[PDB]
Amino acid sequence: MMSIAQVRSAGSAGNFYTDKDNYYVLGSMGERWAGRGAEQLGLQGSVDKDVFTRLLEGRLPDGADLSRMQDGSNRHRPGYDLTFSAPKSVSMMAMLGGDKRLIDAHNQAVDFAVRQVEALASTRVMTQSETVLTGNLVMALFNHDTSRDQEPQLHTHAVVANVTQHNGEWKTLSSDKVGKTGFIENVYANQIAFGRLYREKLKEQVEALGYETEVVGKHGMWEMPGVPVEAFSGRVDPEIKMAEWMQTLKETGFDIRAYRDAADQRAD
């Protein structure tokens, strides 16, 4: 699925989205920019914490500045956090099964979704105020491993900077409580499709890897047949959590190595 939340605040977000703890299992962030708006800014590859924060503050590298300092605070909304999560079976197989391919898959899927999300990118202008599309967003996608559940959760944080290039000028993103014509309003009104779109592209890449899938919930919600999913349901130091995880799995008798070869053969 794809959770939707508003970023707390430059500093706040900065350290959070990169706190190595949120990704100790993975060992890496995987952070890369995204969006026509990001490539249009020369932003490519890894993410510079500072660039990211300034970006959240509303200061682009382009030189444009949408920050509105008012007695210490900034009245410029940072952006929106789109979190795409991977089915327990996969998150597990990806981080505890030693099959990095599944992580790549996860990424690719998010990318395939994030675009469609980008398409809805809009801005406001009057003539009366109206919402005109743009087709671009600036983004920073980070990968985290655990969840509030303290369970493996290969999930990416698609942080959409609250800026959009329209007619040259960098204006803020379309907001509109009323007519729900705002970019974010359309995001809310497509969460299932986009969450499904992300899962759809993943169930295809995984199956091409030789893995099978099964429906477990509505709108798609599937899981990899046979993964001890349940051994991580019903509910410090990252390292202590890792070991725990490793231990909890060995005490299931699942044959990670075999389940893998099982697939390698089934496709190849």
Ligand SMILES: [Mg+2]
């Ligand atoms: Mg997180």
